[PDB]
Amino acid sequence: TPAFNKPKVELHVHLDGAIKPETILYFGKKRGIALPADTVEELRNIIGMDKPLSLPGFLAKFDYYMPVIAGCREAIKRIAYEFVEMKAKEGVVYVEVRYSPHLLANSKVDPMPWNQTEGDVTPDDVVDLVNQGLQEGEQAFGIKVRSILCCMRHQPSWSLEVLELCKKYNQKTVVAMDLAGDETIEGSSLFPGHVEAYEGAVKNGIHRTVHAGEVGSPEVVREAVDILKTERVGAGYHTIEDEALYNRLLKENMHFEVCPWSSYLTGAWDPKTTHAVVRFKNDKANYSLNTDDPLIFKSTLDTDYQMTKKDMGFTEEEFKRLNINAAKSSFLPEEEKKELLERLYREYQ
Ligand SMILES: OC[C@H]1O[C@@H](N2CNc3c(O)ncnc32)[C@H](O)[C@@H]1O
Numbered sequence: 001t002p003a004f005n006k007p008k009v010e011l012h013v014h015l016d017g018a019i020k021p022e023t024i025l026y027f028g029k030k031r032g033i034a035l036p037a038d039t040v041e042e043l044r045n046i047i048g049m050d051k052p053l054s055l056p057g058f059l060a061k062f063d064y065y066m067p068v069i070a071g072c073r074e075a076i077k078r079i080a081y082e083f084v085e086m087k088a089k090e091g092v093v094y095v096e097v098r099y100s101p102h103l104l105a106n107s108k109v110d111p112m113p114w115n116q117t118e119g120d121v122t123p124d125d126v127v128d129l130v131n132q133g134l135q136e137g138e139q140a141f142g143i144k145v146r147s148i149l150c151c152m153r154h155q156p157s158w159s160l161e162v163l164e165l166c167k168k169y170n171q172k173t174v175v176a177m178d179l180a181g182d183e184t185i186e187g188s189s190l191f192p193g194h195v196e197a198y199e200g201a202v203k204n205g206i207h208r209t210v211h212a213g214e215v216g217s218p219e220v221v222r223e224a225v226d227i228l229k230t231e232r233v234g235a236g237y238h239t240i241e242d243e244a245l246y247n248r249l250l251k252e253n254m255h256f257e258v259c260p261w262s263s264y265l266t267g268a269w270d271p272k273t274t275h276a277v278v279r280f281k282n283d284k285a286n287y288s289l290n291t292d293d294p295l296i297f298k299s300t301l302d303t304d305y306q307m308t309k310k311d312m313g314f315t316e317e318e319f320k321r322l323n324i325n326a327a328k329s330s331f332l333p334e335e336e337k338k339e340l341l342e343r344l345y346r347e348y349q
């Protein structure tokens with residue numbers, strides 16, 4: 001019994017965070033790379049989390065499985081393909097999947113991710129592979145899907161190349177650039193590589209999103225918006241701690257990519273306080289409801305919908321509104337953007 005059984009738009013989900021345990025298991029065995037378990041069930045208890053941790057503590061779960069996926073072309077394309085399929089089943093009509101192309105390469109990257117052995121899967125090759133998987137999926141489960149390439153807070157030396165990958169693959173699935181990773185890393189928002197990568201996104205008209213205010217302070221959000229020029233804030237819950245900042249983002253109609261379940265499990269949100277999306281709903285803010293890393297959170301898009309419904313008083317009207325705003329806030333070009341809005345209004349009749 002779904003909380004909102006109608007078309008949805010998802011703007012914040014990590015491809016490397018939305019993989020099938022069965023596919024992880026499949027590639028570990030197939031490539032002979034070890035996993036912390038040999039059963040999807042136990043594999044799910046290891047990778048998965050059911051209790052709040054920290055952002056740094058949540059980010060480590062990727063260590064368990066990324067090594068069986070990274071560097072494998074067959075695996076990179078497959079997870080992309082299975083991703084559309086999963087979203088299609090969730091009643092998502094449009095989705096932007098994000099991921100770091102560097103963390104899945106085994107060539108032309110430095111530091112080599114996961115102590116991998118050099119190979120031929122270059123970062124560009126990864127983008128190409130995901131596009132192919134994503135394309136085959138759209139054209140098979142019939143949902144529209146775009147991708148977003150992530151700069152990693154810890155590795156700014158990779159940022160300018162991410163930008164280049166966005167330029168080269170512009171709308172050839174890639175619609176934007178993100179800044180993901182450990183938001184606790186003091187000053188990561190200000191590292192030259194990142195800063196310079198965004199400055200170029202602005203001059204070359206490459207869309208921009210940035211995780212900020214998930215666990216960091218208002219100043220992290222302020223810098224994402226003012227220095228990095230984000231068009232959207234991933235999470236952004238901590239903005240409400242700076243009344244002035246919030247009101248001004250509210251005025252600019254800043255879009256907040258909200259992930260309810262994820263915020264509890266990463267400690268982004270203290271469960272003894274009211275969720276910031278409650279205030280967002282009440283101030284009629286521009287915001288989407290997203291899944292983030294469903295593999296690790298052992299969830300689905302309905303988990304976040306059921307949570308807001310059951311615990312935060314969300315009605316179908318708010319569900320409709322947030323998704324129309326998500327559509328408007330997407331990085332789809334005008335024509336397609338309108339086509340999306342048209343479908344929502346049609347189906348929302
Ligand atoms: O998907 C690209 C990377 O972004 C990082 N992620 C995933 N989830 C996530 C969270 O919302 N907050 C910050 N960074 C995150 C992970 O390290 C993942 O490998």
Ligand SMILES: [Zn+2]
Pocket residue numbers: 012014180211234292
């Ligand atoms: Zn995220």
